[PDB]
Structures are given as C-alpha cells and as structure tokens.
From Swiss-Prot:
Name of the featured protein: Cytochrome c peroxidase, mitochondrial
Post-translational modification: CCP1 precursor is processed by the rhomboid protease PCP1, which cleaves the N-terminal hydrophobic transit peptide. The m-AAA protease (composed of YTA12/RCA1 and YTA10/AFG3) is required for CCP1 maturation: m-AAA protease promotes membrane dislocation of the CCP1 transmembrane segment within the transit peptide to ensure the correct positioning of CCP1 within the membrane bilayer, allowing intramembrane cleavage by PCP1.
Active-site residue list: 49, 188
Gene from which the chain derives: CCP1
Enzyme Commission code: 1.11.1.5
Record's function text: Destroys radicals which are normally produced within the cells and which are toxic to biological systems.
Family of the protein in this entry: Belongs to the peroxidase family. Cytochrome c peroxidase subfamily.
Species this protein is from: Saccharomyces cerevisiae (strain ATCC 204508 / S288c)
Residue span relative to the full protein: 71 to 361 of 361
C-alpha cells in the first residue's frame, strides 16, 4: 500500500496558515483546560499517536489516513485522554471542512509546538482520509513500564534511530501524566506548556527516587514534584541514550533542530510525496503575524 499525498483541491499555503491560525487562536482562548496547562500538550500527543501507529514493514497505520476518527482507534486504551484534543479540533474541522483528518491532526501538533515557543516544524499537506477498515489495531503505541532495549526496538518500527528517539522524547517536557489515563501521575517539569529542553535537564539534574504511585506502578519522582516514566529514565540508564541526553541538555538550539526534523519525519512516515508536490510549509506563529 502506497499512500500518495494529494493536495486538497485548489489549496495553497495561505489556506493552511488560516487553519494554523484558527488552531492557534483557540489554543490561546481555551486556556483553562487541564488546570491551565491548555491544549498544547495533548495536541502534540494527538499528532504523535495518530502517526505512531505506523509500521515500516507494511505501511499500515501512520498519519495519512486520519483513522483516529474511527472508534477502534479513538478507544485504544493507549489513546485515553486524546479525545480532548479531538474535541478541540472539531470546531476547527467544521470551519475548514476541506482539510483531511490526517492533515488536521498532524497540523494540530505542529501548531501546538510552534505556539508553545518551540522550533518551526515544516509541514506538508496531502494526507487523504481512508476507510474504517484501514484503521490499525490497538497495541502499536508504546508501553511506559519498560527499559531502554524496549524503547530502542520499539522505535525501529517507526524507522527512528537513537538520536531521533531521544529528540522525540523531549516532548515530555510538555503537559503531564494523569493517573486515570495512563496509570502514571505528575508533570515532568515546571515549564509544561512552553517548549524547551527542560526534560533533559531534569533527567540529569533532579534527584530521582523510584516510587510507586497510587495505581501501584513504579515511576521516578523528585522532591520538586516532577516525575519520569521508566521509559524516560531508560534514556539515562543506557549509555548511548545518555550521551544524547547530555547533548540536548547542553544545547537548546540543537535540540530544537533535531526535534523539528524527527517530528516532521514522524508525521510524514508512510506518505509518498510526488516530485511536483508543494515544498513543505513553514507557518508563521500568531506572534510573528501580530495576531
Ligand atoms: C517510549 C515512548 C513513549 C512512551 C512510553 C510515552 C508515554 C506517555 C505516557 C504514559 C503519557 C501520559 C499520558 C497521560 O496520563 O495523560 C505521555 C504523555 C505525553 N507524551 Fe508520551 N510517550 C512516549 C513518547 C512520546 C513522543 C515520541 C511524544 C511526541 C513527540 C510524546 C508526547 C507526549 C505528550 C506531549 C504528553 C503529555 C500529554 C498531556 O499532557 O495530555 N510522547 N506519554
């Protein structure tokens, strides 16, 4: 199965900047969500989980088909809580009914990262909705209770290498774990709706204790009130990951650049872009537009 990007008919960069802007304005307006964290983090996670079902071996799952809109995928236990991101995007989709679902879920993530003062993420249009029977089964998203070997093997299926994995994991600066959702509780840091390299700094610099939470699962906790999942902590247990963690803790621009590449790649896995497709779009933030 080849998934060829097909530009929504007649649309160009300005159309998608209008969708960007509507997302960004609602992010600004709907600021109460999740104890004033706002929707940025869950939109980033929505983009990742709708992309992260991809299997490089047979091109099943991935962002192209926008299959999260079907009940098997929106009810995946791994996706618990993402319905909030979907509901956020609903009025956006109503205003811009021409955008595909995959394009909107992925664009939500791009828009969230950028509006949260993260790197620019080039974004390409052209995902096309595919039918209900193309929805991937549950179980393709990763478990959090595992070690570095698990993480490394997991991400090979998404064609991500060590650097790409460690960069992508930096998104755990954002938002928080919620006990009723994942069986883990707490934020990873203080700046959880501003995109920074804090995840790496906290991994290296906090004094972590291995504790059990109220769901009886182990997680790493600090006196500052932060947590790390076992899979996060694996990035400093594994010496290859550790080197990269230290690099990003010590170079914010490098983290931004590597995150941007890896996140675009994640969002584009499985998609074939024709030779004459438009170049990737780089959207202006609201701030850059004076909006
Ligand atoms: C080994 C890989 C990963 C595992 C096991 C993992 C696991 C988790 C878990 C358990 C949660 C908490 C869900 C909740 O209780 O609300 C979470 C939240 C989150 N994850 Fe991941 N994650 C991984 C990779 C990623 C990647 C690659 C990204 C995106 C680039 C990402 C972005 C997020 C964000 C932004 C949140 C916060 C969501 C919110 O506040 O609502 N994660 N992750």
């Amino acid at each position: 199965l080849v998934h060829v990007a097909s530009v929504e008919k007649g649309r160009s960069y300005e159309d998608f900047q209008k969708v960007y802007n509507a997302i960004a304005l609602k992010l600004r307006e709907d600021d109460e969500y999740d104890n004033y964290i706002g929707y940025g983090p869950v939109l980033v996670r929505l983009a990742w989980h709708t992309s992260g079902t991809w299997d490089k071996h047979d091109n099943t799952g991935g962002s192209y088909g926008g299959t999260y809109r079907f009940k098997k995928e929106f009810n995946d236990p791994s996706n618990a809580g993402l319905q909030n991101g979907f509901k956020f995007l609903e009025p956006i989709h109503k205003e811009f009914p021409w955008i595909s679902s995959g394009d909107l879920f992925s664009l939500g993530g791009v828009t969230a990262v950028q509006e949260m003062q993260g790197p620019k993420i080039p974004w390409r249009c052209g995902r096309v909705d595919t039918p209900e029977d193309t929805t991937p089964d549950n179980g393709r998203l990763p478990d959090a209770d595992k070690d570095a070997d698990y993480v490394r093997t997991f991400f090979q299926r998404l064609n991500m290498n060590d650097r790409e994995v460690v960069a992508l994991m930096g998104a755990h600066a954002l938002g928080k774990t919620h006990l009723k959702r994942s069986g883990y509780e707490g934020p990873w840091g203080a700046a959880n709706n501003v995109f920074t390299n804090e995840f790496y700094l906290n991994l290296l610099n906090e004094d972590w204790k291995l504790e059990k939470n109220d769901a009886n699962n182990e997680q790493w906790d600090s006196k500052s009130g932060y947590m790390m999942l076992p899979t996060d902590y694996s990035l400093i247990q594994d010496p290859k990951y550790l080197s990269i963690v230290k690099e990003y803790a010590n170079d914010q621009d490098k983290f931004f650049k590597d995150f941007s590449k890896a996140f675009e790649k994640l969002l584009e896995n499985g998609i074939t872009f024709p030779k004459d497709a438009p170049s990737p779009f780089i959207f202006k933030t609201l701030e850059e537009q004076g909006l």
